[PDB]
Design a binder for this molecule. Structure first.
Ligand SMILES: O=P(O)(O)C(O)(Cc1cccc(-c2cccc3c2oc2ccccc23)c1)P(=O)(O)O
Ligand SMILES: [Mg+2]
Lengths: 293, 259
């Protein structure tokens, strides 16, 4: 149950890709150029893949679920263009970033086009509820990024709450809005909502562990990610100082306990997904959680 | 009319706009908190939101949703300025991102798919006009006479969407909608033309040896731009007879723009 997902979701994932490329049709070449650069530059497309998978797991058989998948990837794509500017990164998972190749202003402004274009794509579906659920999702995420910019700083519960209510809100919306467009049942809606929130949290926790094993940027700016926290006065300083440069080698110490914590959530999402019909789609959906970790 | 009449006749509507603006920017983060009082709600003329409030009340509106579009319109405008200040700061993008997203949220609260359809396209058009102008920097050759296509989709499309969406959200006749649409379209263009007058090099402005480069050295005092700006204003005032004190302000505002 790993390659089955791709094989099963193949037919529908080729439409989302087509839909994403359809939107890049501005008269301004730069928008299209930068757009083709990041989108066609290799990506695992979990977020649109959750969207299509969620809708057909509750019996949808139009094609609007590819559009909801497509604008979600646009949102995520627009988000990465802005994150590669604030993180001042040179390369995003392999090749160089858009700000490197194209400049900071172009990558920022093309992100605006891409996001606002996802918003028009959202309007055309004509559902006010999906517009509300996602608009607050992306505003909640945007506000937390401003908060991390202005205030550095933790209770296990509290830390997780932030992710549940902010960081992994796009994942949650992705699955929840997919089912809302497919006219699912309130019970199913929560399932997808819960599934999203949790699978995003495990994926977010799992993404904060691959930074150690572009290695070390979490440490190289004082960012309290779950592995980091727990003679260890050299770790507290960095967090408070806001700088942990030159410390990726002498950080092992205890070494994780976050993989089991991410597993908990991975399984947590699975539990909430047992409220909808046993279908290949559902199997695939559940399979993703396992693979997320 | 005149300035004083306008301010006095819009004071009540503007107060709600500020409340809406302040009610939406009451986040915990101080950065966002201080932005609702600094460089907004005092100082500037704030014609944009002023176009919004008067456009709706000139067609017989008497709810309060026209104040929310006025606020989000200013939010849209603030976010572009924040994104245009970037080689660029992290704070300018993320506060812009926040404001942008907030504006979308406010547009959705109005429950009208048509303003969402118009508004959504409006912000996507101005976002493509910033990139366009971004690649039009340090280039006097390609600019030609297609520099009006950048000022329309960047500055004048937000005016148009403000008035036209104010009209639809007041349930107006389809040719009053086209009137305010053209009024925003033309006055917004008149606004930019007059705003490109004197200071900041490296920008192929309408007024046009050359050597487009980064250095403060200009003195040739030899205006068509001003004269051309007035023209559009006339076209803006023209399409507005399709009245009332609120309509006078709109016309008056146009005149004021070309002072
Ligand atoms: O959070 P990280 O920087 O660790 C990362 O996951 C990328 C990322 C994840 C989640 C949100 C964001 C992000 C960053 C900057 C701005 C914005 C982000 O998400 C939104 C949504 C809406 C507006 C702005 C932003 C970036 P990474 O790929 O750099 O590891
Ligand atoms: Mg980041």
């Amino acid at each position: 149950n790993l390659e089955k997902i791709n094989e099963l979701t193949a037919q529908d994932m080729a439409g989302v890709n087509a839909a994403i490329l359809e939107q890049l049709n501005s008269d301004v070449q730069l928008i299209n150029q930068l757009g083709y650069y990041i989108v066609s530059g290799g990506g695992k497309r979990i977020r649109p893949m959750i969207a299509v998978l969620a809708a057909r797991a509750v019996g949808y058989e139009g094609n609007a679920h590819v559009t909801i998948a497509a604008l979600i990837e646009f949102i995520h794509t627009a988000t990465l263009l802005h994150d590669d500017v604030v993180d001042e990164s040179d390369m995003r998972r392999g090749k160089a970033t858009a700000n490197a190749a194209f400049g900071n202003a172009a990558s920022v402004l093309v992100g605006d086009f891409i996001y606002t274009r996802a918003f028009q794509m959202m309007t055309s579906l004509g559902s006010l509820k999906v517009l509300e659920v996602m608009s607050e999702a992306v505003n909640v995420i945007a506000e937390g990024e401003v908060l991390q910019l202005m205030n550095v700083n933790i209770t296990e519960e509290n830390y997780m709450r932030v992710i549940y209510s902010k960081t992994a809100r796009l994942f949650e919306a992705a699955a929840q809005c997919s089912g809302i467009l497919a006219g699912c049942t309130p019970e199913e809606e929560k399932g997808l909502q819960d599934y999203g929130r949790y699978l995003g949290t495990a994926f977010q926790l799992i993404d904060d562990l691959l930074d150690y094993n572009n290695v070390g940027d979490d440490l190289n700016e004082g960012k309290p990610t779950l592995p980091l926290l727990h003679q260890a006065q050299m770790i507290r300083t960095a967090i408070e100082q806001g700088n942990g440069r030159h410390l990726l080698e002498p950080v092992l110490e205890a070494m994780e306990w976050t993989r089991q914590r991410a597993e908990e959530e991975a399984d947590k999402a699975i539990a909430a997904l047992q409220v909808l019909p046993d279908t290949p789609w559902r199997e695939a959906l559940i399979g993703l959680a396992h693979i997320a970790v």
